[PDB]
Amino acid sequence: ASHMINKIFALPVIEQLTPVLSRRQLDDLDLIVVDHPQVKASFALQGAHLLSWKPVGEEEVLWLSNNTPFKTGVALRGGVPICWPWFGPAAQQGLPSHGFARNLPWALKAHNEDDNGVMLTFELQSSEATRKYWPHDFTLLARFKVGKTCEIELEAHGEFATTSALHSYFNVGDIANVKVSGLGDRFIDKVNDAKEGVLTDGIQTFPDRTDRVYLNPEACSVIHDATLNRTIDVVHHHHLNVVGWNPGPALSVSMGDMPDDGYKTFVCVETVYATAPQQATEEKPSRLAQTICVAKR
């Protein structure tokens, strides 16, 4: 991850937005790069996709694939994919997993900054193109706060019912020692025939391919990382579910936008609204949010 992320911060500035915010470009994609005294972070306009976040004094918090394409319309591997207006495999033949918002260019609508960090608002709207495959008008906003902590808030305006996720990839020293706590009790194991399991202590380990939807997780998931000597707190709001995922080695090998050994240095802990649909009116827009906090261990 650190190598690919260092590539982004080495890129020429195409436009200086503010003293800490610049636009740059990698292959096809326009990037917004935050290089602030208290935090480094970067985004693609495509998918309003948070690619990296490193608060001062900490190692990179988000994992980004050193093998991901940066191509128009192609989902980025790593960071925090915004999965909207569906989570997981498409109901319709030929549609991708995790919706279509992560594939389209969002506008950077607003931002502000101070000595502590930066706030940014990205917007996606329906168009004749989106209405071709999803006949609902919408305006989707992704608001970020990047600083000592990282806040992500997704808000969908329209009249529709959806499922969604903030599909975060967290940089870990070694997946073989990672455990995640605060995951509650019941879960659906997608690796094993969607069987429902029950944890008695809310603690998940990732010895191999793991793909679980937690039905009753606590507000705060805690990723314990003995190798980087830290915990990452992932706080979920307005959600129904948390997903824990690591593809393990076979899948890591066959995924072309992943390094063969990529699975070693991330775990996904996702804020999810999947087991029932979320209402947007009308106007009470839907919301889904995740806050990330790093602590020593």
DSSP the chain: -HHHHHHHHHSPPSEE-SSSEEEEEETTEEEEEEEETTEEEEEETBTTEEEEEEETTS---B-B-TT----TTPPPSBSB-EEBS--SS-SSTTPPTTBSGGGSBPEEEEEEE-SS-EEEEEEEE--HHHHHHS----EEEEEEEESSSEEEEEEEESSEEEEEEE--EEE-S-GGG-EEE---SEEEETTTTTEEEE-SSS-EE-SS-EEEEESS--SEEEEEETTTTEEEEEEEES-SEEEEEE-HHHHHHH-TTS-TTGGGGEEEEEEEEEEEEEEE-SS--EEEEEEEEEEE-
Find, among 36, 32, 37, the residue nearest to 50 by Cα: 32
Active site residues: 167, 270
DSSP 206-228: -SS-EEEEESS--SEEEEEETTT
Most distant CA atoms of the chain, gap in Å: 53
Count of all residues that appear for the chain in the document: 297
Find, among 201, 98, 212, 116, the residue nearest to 154 by Cα: 98
Reported CATH class of domain 1-297: mainly beta
The pair of three-digit structure tokens given for residue 267, joined into one six-digit string:
């775990």
Terminal-residue alpha carbon distance, the chain: 21
What's the CA angle centered on 166, arms 124 and 239, to 5 degrees?
105
Residue 161 CA neighbour count, 13 Å, CB half? 6
Q: Residue type at 143?
A: R
What phi, psi does 35 have (nearest 5°)? Answer: -125, 90
Query: How do beta strands 15-16 and 179-181 pair?
Result: unpaired
The distance of Cα 222 from the centroid of its chain, to the nearest Å, equals 16
Flag whether 211 is marked binding.
Answer: yes
Nominal resolution (angstroms):
1.9
Flag whether 77 is marked binding.
Answer: yes
Find, among 243, 86, 236, the residue nearest to 162 by Cα: 86
Whether residue 61 contacts residue 54, with contact meaning beta carbons closer than 8 Å, is answered with yes
CA distances from 193 to 63, 96, 113, 221 (A): 28, 21, 47, 25
Q: Residue type at 181?
A: S
CA distance 183 to 191: 17
Flag whether 24 is marked binding.
Answer: no
The distance of Cα 67 from the centroid of its chain, to the nearest Å, equals 17
